[PDB]
Amino acid sequence: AHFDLRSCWCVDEAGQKLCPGSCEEVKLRVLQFIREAEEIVTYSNSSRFPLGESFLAAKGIRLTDEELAFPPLSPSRETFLEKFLSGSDYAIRLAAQSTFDFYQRRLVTLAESPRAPSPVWSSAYLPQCDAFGGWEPVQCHAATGHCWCVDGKGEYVPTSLTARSRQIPQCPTSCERLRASGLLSSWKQAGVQAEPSPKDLFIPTCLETGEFARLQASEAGTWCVDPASGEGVPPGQCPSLCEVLQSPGYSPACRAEDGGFSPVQCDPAQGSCWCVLGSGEEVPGTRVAGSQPACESPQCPLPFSVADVAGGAILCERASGAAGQRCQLRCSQGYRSAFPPEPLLCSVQRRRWESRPPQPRACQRPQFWQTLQTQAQFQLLDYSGLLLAFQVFLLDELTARGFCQIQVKTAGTPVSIPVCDDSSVKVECLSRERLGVNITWKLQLVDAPPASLPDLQDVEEALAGKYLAGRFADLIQSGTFQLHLDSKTFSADTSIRFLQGDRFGISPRTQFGCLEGFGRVVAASDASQDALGCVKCPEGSYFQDEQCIPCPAGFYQEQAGSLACVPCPEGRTTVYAGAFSQ
Amino acid sequence: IREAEEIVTYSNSSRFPLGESFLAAKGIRLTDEELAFPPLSPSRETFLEKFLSGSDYAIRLAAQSTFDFYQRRLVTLAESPRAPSPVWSSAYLPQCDAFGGWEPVQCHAATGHCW
Amino acid sequence: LELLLDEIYDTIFAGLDLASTFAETTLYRILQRRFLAVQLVISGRFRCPTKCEVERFAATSFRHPYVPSCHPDGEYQAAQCQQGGPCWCVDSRGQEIPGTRQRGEPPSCAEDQSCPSERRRAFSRLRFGPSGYFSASCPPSIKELFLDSGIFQPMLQGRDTRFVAPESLLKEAIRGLFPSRELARLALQFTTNAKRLQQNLFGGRFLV
Amino acid sequence: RLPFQKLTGISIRNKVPMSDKSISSGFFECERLCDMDPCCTGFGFLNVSQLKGGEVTCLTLNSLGLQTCSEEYGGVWRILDCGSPDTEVRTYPFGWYQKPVSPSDAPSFCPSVALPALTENVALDSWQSLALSSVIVDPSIRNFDVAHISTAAVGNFSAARDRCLWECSRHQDCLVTTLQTQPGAVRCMFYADTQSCTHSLQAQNCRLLLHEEATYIYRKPNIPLPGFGTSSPSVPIATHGQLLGRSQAIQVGTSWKPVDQFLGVPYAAPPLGEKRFRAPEHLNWTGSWEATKPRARCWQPGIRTPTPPGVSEDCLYLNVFVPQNMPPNASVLVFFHNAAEGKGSGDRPAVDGSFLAAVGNLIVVTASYRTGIFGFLSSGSSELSGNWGLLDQVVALTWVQTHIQAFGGDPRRVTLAADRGGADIASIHLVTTRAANSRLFRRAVLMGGSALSPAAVIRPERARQQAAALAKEVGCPSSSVQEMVSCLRQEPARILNDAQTKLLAVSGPFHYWGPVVDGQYLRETPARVLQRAPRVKVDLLIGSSQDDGLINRAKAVKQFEESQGRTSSKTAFYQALQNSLGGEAADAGVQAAATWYYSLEHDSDDXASFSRALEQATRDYFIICPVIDMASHWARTVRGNVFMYHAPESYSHSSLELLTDVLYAFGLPFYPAYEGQFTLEEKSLSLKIMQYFSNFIRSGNPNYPHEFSRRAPEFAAPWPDFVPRDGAESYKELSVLLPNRQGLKKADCSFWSKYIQSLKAS
Amino acid sequence: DLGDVMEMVFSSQGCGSLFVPACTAEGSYEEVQCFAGDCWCVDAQGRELAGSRVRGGRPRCPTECEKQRARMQSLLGSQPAGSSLFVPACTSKGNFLPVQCFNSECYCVDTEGQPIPGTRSALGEPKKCPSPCQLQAERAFLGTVRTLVYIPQCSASGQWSPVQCDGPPE
Ligand SMILES: *[C@@H]1O[C@H](CO)[C@@H](O[C@@H]2O[C@H](CO)[C@@H](O[C@@H]3O[C@H](CO)[C@@H](O)[C@H](O)[C@@H]3O)[C@H](O)[C@H]2NC(C)=O)[C@H](O)[C@H]1NC(C)=O
Ligand SMILES: *[C@@H]1O[C@H](CO[C@@H]2O[C@@H](C)[C@@H](O)[C@@H](O)[C@@H]2O)[C@@H](O[C@@H]2O[C@H](CO)[C@@H](O)[C@H](O)[C@H]2NC(C)=O)[C@H](O)[C@H]1NC(C)=O
Ligand SMILES: *[C@@H]1O[C@H](CO)[C@@H](O[C@@H]2O[C@H](CO)[C@@H](O)[C@H](O)[C@H]2NC(C)=O)[C@H](O)[C@H]1NC(C)=O
Ligand SMILES: *[C@@H]1O[C@H](CO)[C@@H](O)[C@H](O)[C@H]1NC(C)=O
Ligand SMILES: *[C@@H]1O[C@H](CO)[C@@H](O)[C@H](O)[C@H]1NC(C)=O
Ligand SMILES: *[C@@H]1O[C@H](CO)[C@@H](O)[C@H](O)[C@H]1NC(C)=O
Ligand SMILES: *[C@@H]1O[C@H](CO)[C@@H](O)[C@H](O)[C@H]1NC(C)=O
């Protein structure tokens, strides 16, 4: 009957009373851990407990509430004590996590003198889930730069662990993993699941996007499955993913042609109405929180005979009224536009793009921050001459005294991390006999050894501490830095200053950046907010100056992450900009 | 007794997190450089050394300061249930003669035991 | 050394085809190993002098102020010194490591220092959080295959002798006798019993 | 200098003789001739016409074509062009030389040169393209070959790909081709079988092992053998006809694998009537043999008096378990086993080889054979030599040598296995010169038995006495061997089996039948044969269970005795103690020494305690210490690789007659018939042990699935070699943690092998 | 290379959750390491010693005498039966005993276990040794002299004087 008249909850597979998907269920435990660790900090500022009571719990002794004669309070002693009576690894992580957070807040509030607070994306590992509570095949930890593959149920896939690579690895979906293994070894799936014959066994068929195809077949016959999981047997000529869901909070309204999600979805209660992909996942930037969110498709065709935008889609407003049909390119979740935001305008009447045509290959995969940078300034104590010689001479003197390498005190052999290049030293003439010198140390994270510098905080302190920047400030403040140039001596002044984001301070601050071929998509200031700040310049593009710029008309580029655009043959040209093939 | 009352003192003006003594009991102490914590007059080291050695001295010290914290509070917030303990029921204090020697009789008032 | 070819035997260890170069023949390998054995008797080492030892010898001969100091296995010592002068730390090439120049004491040349890296790895393991796959210990398979089986232990100690081999003698011997994995694989192909191995490698019972 | 020795499709610019010069001068000229030609990409300095003595030659080239036959690669497995005897290009400084690779091309006037076009097309759709997530880089890989294609010799990548896919398609042992772009060339790599699977209780994930990263990976799908492909496989058997099997789906975790099963395949004529107590004979069958049901099992002591339907003298059959879509030339396990059934049905074999075959990716053959009197009755002489059941095992092994290719197995990759009694019986094949001259097997798995057992062979006079006692028990005459055999050949099998069960009781005469030295198959006792120098190498995996013992092995005989009205009287205790440790196994001194060492009380009445002490005494003497002696001898004399296990005591599954090592190694926790009887920890332990045993069958080392890969095992801890020296002697303990331990039963086996073997030597 | 394999196996002799090693300011292992209520002593490479681990407490790590005693006792197990090789005697706190004897000859020794000249005698003949205050005092007259390149005060009889003073000696 399935009638509702009683209290309900969600339960595990073995009756644990705890509906969430696998990844989302694991995700909720980590969110509980953070909340408890912050409750410990909360109770540690308003003094409700003695300092030594957690030590007493760690030794197995707890004082019952009757023998204390302590009238119960809303934050009962029991809530705090249970966390620490079980001397498990959970309590040790909980006590550690709350211990840093207590001190880091205090240090900051009393006097934020020494250094910067940690980026808010360096925290406990949080599982990354898809739109339907399942595991995303790629799992990453920003605080260490570690990425790995998991299978359909979140188990680590052997030898898939990578550390601080330029490209985030590719991990097969559950369908693709099952299909490739089935083709190699004939380890198959069962169609009937109870006493299967060899004709009931099948190898899953996958859509090119990595999803299970709606119809799976064996020699016994065919049947329908859930696209997000092959579980199948949806008993509601195969039900669409929406139709399976239709019989995500509010149930989605879907289009009659095939069953694909209608472009405009809505929340009946909350006022939010937004757009969705063909998959049914939400476009990240479309929640309108109002009627008729701009979900309309363009009337102008794409620039170079391309069928559809790869990652995102071009979502216009309603047909405008004069002929603009204002549109904008919105990339899907897990994608960013390589080129900066643009407003696109379409000629409904010419039927051609009046504005710059949209870039079909813009939306790309973001990557982690790839470089760290610190900058210091000192002064060397004629004009209207070629100073670029002094840029080479100063770099040589810095190299000679070991200020262009980081030496890491490892166990055996020490690795050396190079932190200079030909652009590291810039000199400007300020006044007679006093030159102005800029020194910039840039560490590429792919060179920092993950075994000696585990966290990105360890990398920052190696670059802005006693081995590189603290050791250089002392040398300048002493007075023993002089440059030998044809029997002439250029001794340096004792004053040294550090860049701190447009305010020269007295302490070095690091700044995140991207590698040579990768364009910035996150501003420098809010690099503490978002960890994915680098996208590779796409096929239609070249790199200059931290941005990815589309090949101009008459030029084409075919390989991504390039520094120039190949010209077309003298007899030919390109109709639009951003051409991406011969 | 003085150390046990210092623990109560630091437990009212919040200078330490509640879980740091638990961390010390497990053998993990956070050094002052990695916290980037500028030293204060009641340095973290004074409190932590008492609890890193997981000896019987620390267990008695943590217990003694735990009752005293709650008994003061219970009284200050609302002295409803019962009377405070007699101030002569405390840790055993050796009874000495006028010249620092042991008195042949030793007694513990809190238990009524003499030897 | 003048090595005489009149009384050298023939050997079982060999390839299927004749070597491309003389450096890949059994003739060169036999001469090289006999040379190393004589080096062992006349110098204490189953090898030729290292870069450190050559420079130390030249400095002592010409009485230079800075004499490099070497470990008995030939490696540069971490702490180098000048006569009544400054002290510093060097790398494996004997080149001074920047920022380590002390004055009076033999410098605190960082030799073991496994702790601060170990301590950092433990903190990053603590901070990872409760659930999820993580980011002095035995290297994989080494203990089981080499030490659980009891293969290594008879190699280390003398048989009917109190002589205990230094680690350098064992490392020098394996390098001198088998320059590559492919040559050691050839020896295993043609050596049935180990009582024949020295005779094949040296063209005779040379070590006695 | 190129590492490649053979170039195909080259383009020559000039040919210059250099025989009137020194080799150094000719090389110097050849270098400067290619310098002067702006279109020269390299030269050859070589001897041509080497069969007539060789002529020094300089060849300037404007294309190197397809470069093959590297000296660095193709060591174990070569597929490409090699061995041109009319040319000498190896000896220094001969070789093919390349002008240094530059991204600046030759002058535009240089002739265009391209590799000759392929005679037939390449589908690209008959090849499976693999992603990088389906591969593992393993630099220990050795069974691969390499070719290089000059980047100027192919118009584009598609031409290079079709050339390299064509080379692999011509060789049937080439399974995988990978392509990778180098600055100067396209590097093609060709692989044999390199598959590696991760086994768990959820899903079985399999990957390819490659020597290095590559950009494109193409795999050739496995084509089924002529009779395979459907759920009614029909395999041609040469000189016989068709063999018709069935297909079964096998579940491990949440994955399913189809395995083809051929049940009840005859390997000899039924030994009935005049064929009783005779050597096995060829069975001439033609047409179609229906191989979908298990056949009858052989007579064994203690069969129940209401004869079960599956007991017969017609029992010389084998079962073949073939997983679908294996790579060619699979390794083969031949496991000899007579089931003491009562639980196995008429449609399911008692030992199902499907799970080990599927997990191990190999072929399992289980065969039955004559045991007891039917397999070993002997008069101690040429009149009734005996060893009839040993000759069954030889015939069954010869059948595998003849016929296994048709199922897809390599006759050179056969492992012989047996358990308990058969391990003692099957270990005789290791000391017979005929079994080595026939190369019937390459490896052996002995599970609880050894050739150094005190009961391995029966002395000829004991056999004559034992034959007469059976004649006397059934009413036959013992006066002449020919007269006694005739009367025993007319008896019912039920009557003969009741007589042998009565005489086999340890509390009675202890008349056990086994192999005898006959002077034909077995020329001398196993101890003498093993003192000789080995002729061939055989890898040995050997072990024992703490739950084994003589009484455990004879529980059916004991049950029969009780049903006949014979209990443990005091003389039963007496005979049990003397028979166990005696009968050529003890004088009056060995019995006293063992009595002291094991606290054996001859004149007790507590059958429980006395049996426990005796079972501990006889397990060491008959089972555990002979296993350790054989492993030590096999390692000390370099007869092959030795690996030892020990299965510690269990209390969990006494209803099953299989001991712990066979139950785990064959995967009984995964059998559908035992659902609900095993924990997930026993399933997980069994899956690991099947990977150990599969690895040994495939490569002769329980740590490695492939002979030419040495990637460390990940499913469990590595299994050490057995080194026969004090302080070493390591073994794998078959417990949940699979630890490595040292010196099994060191004190107890010293007593038997040193002190007792010296009491018997005086 | 195969020489590297030999070094890796040699290093791996004696090899092995949320344990955090404690380091010194100079980057060396603190010689006492503790986790989850246990504490043990470690060497320079941070390897636990066999008998150091003590539950619910902090161990005292081996001293000079204790290490010599454990070394001489692993070689008295190679000497023949009825034979004596010297073995130093150590107090419970690790210090040397005042008198050491061997083949019926006895010496007074200092805190480093070195014979004091003029103190030898025969076993069975009582010998007056310098007091522990006299030895730590002398041993510190040259702690001072070495550094230029308090020292302890001994009440009558060599018994430590209850009042002790700091500074240069006088
Ligand atoms: C490449 O070809 C050249 C020329 O054909 C080879 O040189 C020739 O080598 C043979 C034998 O090695 C020499 O023949 C004679 O051998 C007898 C032995 O019976 C010896 O007594 C003579 O003194 C002489 O060596 C021949 O002189 C020699 N020719 C020249 C011009 O040197 C060469 O061996 C070939 N290289 C390879 C690697 O095959
Ligand atoms: C001293 O050495 C000679 C020479 O032996 C050869 O050269 C050695 C360096 C070593 O490589 C040996 O294996 C070589 O055989 C010995 O004389 C030889 O002795 C062996 C066995 O006695 C005999 O077979 C050879 O024919 C002998 N050869 C000659 C030229 O005499 C000699 O025995 C050695 N002396 C001692 C005391 O060992
Ligand atoms: C040395 O570094 C300083 C700080 O980065 C540079 O000063 C900046 O110059 C840019 C470009 O002229 C301005 O937009 C910023 O506002 C300046 N910042 C500050 C704090 O002055 C300076 O130009 C550098 N000198 C050289 C020669 O490169
Ligand atoms: C503690 O709480 C007070 C308010 O009661 C607040 O002002 C202060 O900032 C807090 N200190 C922290 C969170 O470190
Ligand atoms: C804590 O300190 C405050 C003053 O800061 C005091 O008023 C209060 O009574 C104290 N609480 C105790 C000692 O429990
Ligand atoms: C590659 O070259 C071949 C050579 O004939 C020819 O098919 C064509 O030029 C190219 N084909 C492709 C698919 O690039
Ligand atoms: C199996 O091996 C044989 C000999 O090694 C070889 O000739 C054959 O090609 C291989 N493959 C098949 C399918 O027989």
Author numbering:
A (entry chain A): 892 to 909, 922 to 1139, 1145 to 1155, 1164 to 1237, 1241 to 1300, 1310 to 1510
B (entry chain B): 937 to 1051
C (entry chain B): 250 to 384, 406 to 478
D (entry chain A): 1969 to 2730
E (entry chain B): 594 to 609, 614 to 746, 759 to 779
Q: Mind quoting what the paper says about this structure?
A:
Here, a three-dimensional cryoEM reconstruction of bovine thyroglobulin at an overall resolution of 2.6 Å is presented. In this report, we present a high-resolution structure of purified Tg (iodinated in vivo with normal iodide content) from the bovine thyroid gland. We have been able to definitively identify three (of 70) tyrosine side chains per Tg monomer that are modified either to diiodotyrosine or thyroxine (Tyr24 and Tyr2575, indicative of acceptor sites). In addition, we observe four tyrosines with no discernible side chain despite well defined main-chain density, which we have tentatively assigned as dehydroalanines (Tyr89, Tyr149, Tyr1395 and Tyr2542); these are the only identifiable candidates as donors in thyroid hormone formation. Our high-resolution cryoEM map and model provide clear structural evidence for Tyr24–Tyr149 and Tyr2575–Tyr2542 functioning as acceptor–donor pairs. The distance between the Tyr24–Tyr149 acceptor–donor pair is 27.4 Å (Cα–Cα) in our structure in which thyroxine has already been formed. When compared with the non-iodinated human Tg cryoEM structure, the α-helix with Tyr2542 has been slightly unwound and rotated, resulting in a 7 Å shift from its relative position in non-iodinated Tg, effectively creating the binding pocket for T4 at Tyr2575.
Thyroglobulin (Tg) is a 660 kDa (2 × 330 kDa) homodimeric protein which is the most highly expressed protein in the thyroid gland. The protein is secreted by thyrocytes into the thyroid follicle lumen where, upon iodination by thyroid peroxidase, Tg functions as a scaffold protein for thyroid hormonogenesis and as a storage protein for both thyroid hormones and iodide. An oxidative coupling reaction in which a diiodotyrosine (DIT) acceptor receives (via a covalent quinol-ether linkage) the iodophenolic ring of a neighboring DIT donor results in the formation of thyroxine at an acceptor site and dehydroalanine at the corresponding donor site. Tg is a homodimeric protein packed with multiple Tg type 1 (Tg1) repeating structural motifs.
